[PDB]
Amino acid sequence: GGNLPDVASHYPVAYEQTLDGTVGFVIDEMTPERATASVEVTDTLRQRWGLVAGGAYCALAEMLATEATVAVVHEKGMMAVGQSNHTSFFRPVKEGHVRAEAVRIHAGSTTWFWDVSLRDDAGRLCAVSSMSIAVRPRRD
Amino acid sequence: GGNLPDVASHYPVAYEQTLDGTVGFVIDEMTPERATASVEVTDTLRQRWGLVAGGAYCALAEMLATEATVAVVHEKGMMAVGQSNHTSFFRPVKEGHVRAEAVRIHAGSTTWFWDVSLRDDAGRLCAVSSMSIAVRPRRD
Amino acid sequence: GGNLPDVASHYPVAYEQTLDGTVGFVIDEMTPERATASVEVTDTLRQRWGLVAGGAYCALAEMLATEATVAVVHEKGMMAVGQSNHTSFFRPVKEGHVRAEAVRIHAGSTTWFWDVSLRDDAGRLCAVSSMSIAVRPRRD
Amino acid sequence: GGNLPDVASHYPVAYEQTLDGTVGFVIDEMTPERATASVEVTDTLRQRWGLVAGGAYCALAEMLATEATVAVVHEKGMMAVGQSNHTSFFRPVKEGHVRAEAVRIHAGSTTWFWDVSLRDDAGRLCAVSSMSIAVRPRRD
Ligand SMILES: CC(C)(COP(=O)(O)OP(=O)(O)OC[C@H]1O[C@@H](n2cnc3c(N)ncnc32)[C@H](O)[C@@H]1OP(=O)(O)O)[C@@H](O)C(=O)NCCC(=O)NCCSCC(=O)c1ccc(O)cc1
Ligand SMILES: CC(C)(COP(=O)(O)OP(=O)(O)OC[C@H]1O[C@@H](n2cnc3c(N)ncnc32)[C@H](O)[C@@H]1OP(=O)(O)O)[C@@H](O)C(=O)NCCC(=O)NCCSCC(=O)c1ccc(O)cc1
Ligand SMILES: CC(C)(COP(=O)(O)OP(=O)(O)OC[C@H]1O[C@@H](n2cnc3c(N)ncnc32)[C@H](O)[C@@H]1OP(=O)(O)O)[C@@H](O)C(=O)NCCC(=O)NCCSCC(=O)c1ccc(O)cc1
Ligand SMILES: CC(C)(COP(=O)(O)OP(=O)(O)OC[C@H]1O[C@@H](n2cnc3c(N)ncnc32)[C@H](O)[C@@H]1OP(=O)(O)O)[C@@H](O)C(=O)NCCC(=O)NCCSCC(=O)c1ccc(O)cc1
Incomplete structure (x- = not known):
């Protein structure tokens, strides 16, 4: 269950x-x-050229950012969802692992923002994602 | 496969x-x-809350934009990779299909830019992705 | 008064x-x-290298997007403000004019999104800005 | 002037x-x-609603990121220009100063990436800008 x-x-x-x-x-x-x-990294994370697909780093970042926000806001009657993701790709990853670290930089009443760094096994910064997370009252 | x-x-x-x-x-x-x-749309595309994961829209966008660039530049001796992906999420998708249309808006010598709209079965615009694609000389 | x-x-x-x-x-x-x-274009719009400053196209886009939203939502007791701007720069502008056209692509209860194209006197696409506009009940 | x-x-x-x-x-x-x-902050920095215009944060960010890149690459025969600016707006600024800190996060051969934080006089984070800077060989 991914430790969510x-x-x-x-x-x-x-x-x-x-x-x-799945991935x-x-x-x-x-x-x-x-x-x-x-x-x-396995083939399921890659695209046909053998590199990790950009959407894999985006999916990693958004789950981490979104669920870290859910962790706080759920018990408050709120829901949290990804509203925007801007990911930039600095170095490809061919194999090994991708490690993500999400740092909360703003926590507003309606929007939280997380900066997510994605590193390879050598600790090099392969991608960054700025996740903006919409926070709304739960619907019934 | 997938008609790339x-x-x-x-x-x-x-x-x-x-x-x-896989997806x-x-x-x-x-x-x-x-x-x-x-x-x-199937579970493999969704996250745990039952909606299509934002990363799925991003991966569909980046493959369409990048591969559309490859189809032109590969024979010219170039490589094309995703360098940035800015995606915004307007309406969730629970089921059906997700349909993407990529439109090229700038074709520079080093960067091509594609705008990709992602729509649900009713035609509603659920996400948009701005793809920036780096075009470089092949190394091998 | 800019025809706002x-x-x-x-x-x-x-x-x-x-x-x-001012500009x-x-x-x-x-x-x-x-x-x-x-x-x-005048020097006030330029930076020291003689090109239009990226922030000039961002300022143009956000005023156009924000105020087109104000035009609708103000009489409804709402305020509208820029929440994010992603601008990409395809060709520099040295002199002449910059013309912006803003197209609304989503109008949600809390967020409206505008795609803004910025063209030179030859009609070439020099920049694009995706503006996301936060819409909130006016404070008293 | 301005200590570039x-x-x-x-x-x-x-x-x-x-x-x-000018600003x-x-x-x-x-x-x-x-x-x-x-x-x-003075009126020349604000928009009509009396807050600092988003474009002002973007122009402060892009000048700091681009010029910090120029300071390194110019002597190496390169030019540096802003190629993308993604800025998000967390808290408005009405008066005082805006203080920016640019941190370099990736220095590629063709692209440098800077994260710029913009804070008000109380130290609060009011906006962040991700600057991507293109680095190319000078034409003249
Ligand atoms: C975007 C948003 C409204 C979203 O709020 P959030 O992320 O949920 O944060 P939260 O709602 O917790 O509020 C944070 C602060 O925002 C302000 N704010 C939030 N909601 C409201 C509201 N309904 N009414 C007034 N102030 C508000 C207020 O300063 C609040 O602080 P506090 O008084 O609550 O301590 C808030 O983050 C924000 O105000 N960001 C700054 C927006 C900004 O300054 N953008 C640039 C200026 S507007 C764009 C522009 O350049 C322009 C130019 C020319 C033109 O003619 C028109 C526009
Ligand atoms: C970023 C990039 C260089 C990438 O090139 P690309 O996407 O491959 O497009 P391509 O290379 O096909 O060339 C497009 C056009 O860019 C220009 N360009 C491209 N490479 C060069 C170069 N090496 N030298 C001079 N111009 C070039 C040139 O105008 C070209 O048209 P053409 O003469 O080739 O017909 C190009 O898209 C571009 O120049 N974009 C506009 C950049 C821009 O104007 N940004 C805003 C101004 S700089 C940031 C700023 O505000 C600032 C403020 C204060 C300050 O102190 C410093 C900076
Ligand atoms: C972002 C936002 C909530 C903002 O709403 P808005 O721009 O003001 O639009 P509006 O509020 O007018 O609502 C449009 C639609 O959003 C939905 N929505 C909006 N607010 C709510 C709410 N409080 N409760 C439930 N649905 C809502 C609803 O579908 C609404 O349609 P309708 O039923 O009202 O006709 C809405 O645009 C939206 O729902 N966008 C889609 C968000 C999305 O699907 N993101 C990706 C999935 S969540 C991110 C993720 O991948 C993830 C992965 C793993 C994991 O473990 C956790 C997360
Ligand atoms: C975009 C760019 C090429 C620009 O280069 P840069 O910012 O100047 O950095 P620089 O050129 O200094 O090189 C950085 C690294 O990139 C790689 N690289 C750069 N240029 C090349 C090249 N011409 N050929 C091969 N690798 C290169 C290389 O790994 C390099 O490290 P090193 O071998 O030089 O030490 C580089 O930052 C990069 O490669 N980023 C990662 C791109 C990426 O992995 N995107 C995601 C995958 S591609 C998109 C996708 O998901 C997709 C999915 C399905 C499908 O069918 C197609 C595509």
């Missing part, structure tokens, strides 16, 4: 069948201000 | 095994200025 | 003393779904 | 006459990895 925050008795999609569980993401640490996650 | 441009005799990773083949993306039209693709 | 929409008896800053009036922006057309604006 | 890097004997436009000189931007520190600048 446990905020509800039931979720619509079991984690392992999600896009996230094998796992959350390591999570606090209100910071969170980390990682994944092993 | 056939520009080389073999590829590092078989399409059906890539992230893109079921299929390219329909492709021209130097415009390309379309679509995918059937 | 007249929605209030008093504004805190006279338009001519604004950043916008000489003027709105030409405005509807709920589309709006246009232009400016003459 | 002095890398050439003359410049196309005198700084005091540029957009940047009063001043660079404080500059190193190959980090740079700071600030500006006093």
Whole structure:
């Protein structure tokens, strides 16, 4: 179950069948201000040229940012969803792992912003994602 | 597979095994200025809350934009990779298909820029992605 | 007064003393779904290398997008403000004019999105800005 | 003026006459990895609603990031221009100063990337800008 925050008795999609569980993401640490996650590179994470697909780093970042926000706001009657993701790609990843670290930089009443760094096994900065997370009252 | 441009005799990773083949993306039209693709929504595309993951829209966008660039520049001795992807999420998608249309808006010597709209089965605009593609001389 | 929409008896800053009036922006057309604006290039719009400063195209886009939203939402008791601007720069402008055209692509209850194209005197696409406009109940 | 890097004997436009000189931007520190600048808020920086215009944060960011790149690459025969600017707006600024700190996060051969934070007099983070800078061989 990816070590995601446990905020509800039931979720619509079991984690392992999600896009996230399919490609094998796992959350390591999570606090209100910071969170980390990682994944092993396999072909399922790659595109046909053999590099990790840009959308894999975006998916990693948005799950980490979104769920770190859910962790806080769910018990407050709020829902949180990705509203925008700007990801830039500095160095490709061919194999090994991708490690993500999300740092909360603003927590507003309606929008939280996380900066997510994505590093290879050598610790080099391969991508960054700025995630903006919409926070809204839950619908009934 | 998935009807990508056939520009080389073999590829590092078989399409059906890539992230893109796993989630079921299929390219329909492709021209130097415009390309379309679509995918059937299934759990493998969703996150745990039962909506299509933002990363899925981003990966559909970047494949369509990048591969549409490859189809032109590969024979000219160039490589094309995603360098930035800014995606914004307007309406969630729970089920059906996601249909993408990529329109080329600038074709520089070093950077091509594509705007990709992602629509649900009702035609509603659920996400947009601005793809910047780096075009460089092949190393090998 | 830049032909901005007249929605209030008093504004805190006279338009001519604004950043916008300083560099000489003027709105030409405005509807709920589309709006246009232009400016003459002068040194005040340039940076020290003699090209139009990237922030000039961003300022043009955000005023056009924001105020086209104000035009609709003000009389509804709402305020509208720029929440994010992603601008990409395809060709520099040395002299002449910059013309902007803003197309509304999503109008949500809390967020409207405008795509803004910025063209030179030859009609070439020099920059694009994706403006996301936050819409909130006015404070008292 | 404004304490920019002095890398050439003359410049196309005198700084005091540029957009940047008109609004009063001043660079404080500059190193190959980090740079700071600030500006006093006056009407010339604001829009009509009395808040600092988003374009002002963007122009302060892009000048600091681009000029910090110029200071390194100019002597190597390169030019540096802003190619993308993604700025997000967290808290408005009504008066005081805006202080910017640019941190270099990637220095590629063709693209440098800078993250610029913009803070008010209380130290609060009011906007962030991700600057991508293109680095190319000079034409003349
Ligand atoms: C975008 C947003 C409204 C979203 O709020 P959020 O992320 O949920 O943050 P939160 O709602 O927690 O509020 C943070 C601060 O925003 C302000 N704010 C938020 N909502 C409101 C509201 N309904 N009414 C007044 N102020 C508000 C207020 O300063 C608040 O601080 P506090 O008084 O609550 O301590 C808020 O982050 C924000 O105000 N950001 C700054 C927006 C900004 O300054 N943009 C650039 C100026 S407007 C764009 C422009 O350049 C322009 C130029 C010419 C022209 O003619 C028109 C526009
Ligand atoms: C970024 C890039 C160089 C990339 O090139 P590209 O996407 O491959 O397009 P391509 O290289 O095909 O060339 C497009 C045009 O860019 C210009 N360009 C490209 N390479 C060069 C070069 N090496 N030298 C001079 N101009 C060039 C040239 O105008 C070209 O047209 P043409 O003469 O070739 O017909 C190009 O898209 C571009 O120049 N964009 C505009 C950049 C811009 O104007 N940004 C805003 C101004 S700089 C940032 C700023 O505000 C600032 C403020 C204060 C300050 O102190 C410093 C900076
Ligand atoms: C961002 C926002 C909430 C803002 O709303 P807006 O721009 O003001 O638009 P508006 O509020 O007019 O609502 C449009 C539609 O959004 C939905 N929506 C808006 N607010 C709500 C709400 N409070 N509750 C439920 N649905 C809402 C609803 O579908 C609405 O349609 P309608 O039922 O009202 O006709 C809305 O545009 C939106 O829902 N966009 C889509 C967000 C999305 O699908 N993102 C990607 C999935 S979440 C990110 C992710 O990938 C993830 C992955 C793994 C993981 O573990 C966690 C997350
Ligand atoms: C975009 C750019 C080429 C620009 O280069 P830069 O910012 O100047 O950095 P620089 O050129 O200094 O080189 C950085 C590294 O990039 C790689 N690189 C740069 N130029 C080249 C080249 N001509 N050929 C091969 N690799 C290169 C190389 O790894 C280099 O490290 P090194 O071997 O030089 O030490 C580089 O930053 C980069 O390669 N970024 C990563 C691009 C990326 O991985 N995007 C995601 C994958 S491609 C998009 C996608 O998902 C997709 C999916 C499906 C599909 O069918 C097609 C595409």
